[PDB]
Symmetry: C2
Subunit: 130 residues, 2 copies
């Protein structure tokens, strides 16, 4: 009747390119300003649809019906820069790495953005070192 | 030294959500107006970063350094609406289906946007029916 085809690799390749576009600040449309205790701010550019695709919290926050018309800054307080960076990194690459003291703070950032995949992975490392 | 983790499923889930966001016209930032012979126009909303992630042609066309500040319309002539729809669909889901007369016109749309994965798949169906 009909001919179809699926490339089983397409999502990995494309996130790859989207991660490239982020590192080069191309097509970005949100900057997260994270400010946390005394460490000065950081800025992260990213793509709102890529954030919303991995976090129900970023989904809800960016899908409200408002229109961008430029760059929206999101002030994000209550999380160390290094934890937001690794969580954006997970959004864009599906991987995440950390040492054993930061693994506590990463499960708190993942719970805050409902990145449940990371939450369960941390919660496993925490009982596999106890 | 350090603890890391990779969710081998994350890209498929997230494209899933991005495809959802497209169907609902949320966070979109390009409308392709395809006009082709006498069939009237069609409009497709999509996410420029998701287009650019799957097509070198859409990459180059959206990554020039210009800023969006709203919705950019791309006039796309020289391809049937049904072929652009299925190619956007491939961008967002990695799959594509078609009957045997449209499979000719899809390999021409894929070559036009350098969606090489589809091009080689069509080029195989064309010699597997001859």
């Amino acid at each position: 009747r009909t001919f179809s085809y699926t490339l089983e690799d397409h999502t990995k390749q494309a996130f790859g390119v989207m991660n490239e576009l982020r590192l080069s600040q191309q097509l970005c449309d949100v900057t997260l300003q994270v400010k946390y205790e005394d460490i000065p701010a950081a800025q992260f550019m990213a793509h709102k649809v890529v954030l919303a695709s991995s976090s129900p919290v970023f989904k809800a926050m960016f899908t409200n019906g408002l229109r961008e018309q430029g760059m929206e800054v999101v002030s994000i307080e209550g999380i160390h820069p290094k934890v937001m960076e690794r969580l954006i990194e997970f959004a864009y690459t599906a991987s995440i790495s950390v040492g054993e003291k930061c693994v506590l703070h990463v499960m708190n950032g993942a719970v805050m953005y409902q990145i449940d995949s990371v939450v369960r992975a941390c919660a496993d490392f925490l009982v596999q070192q106890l």
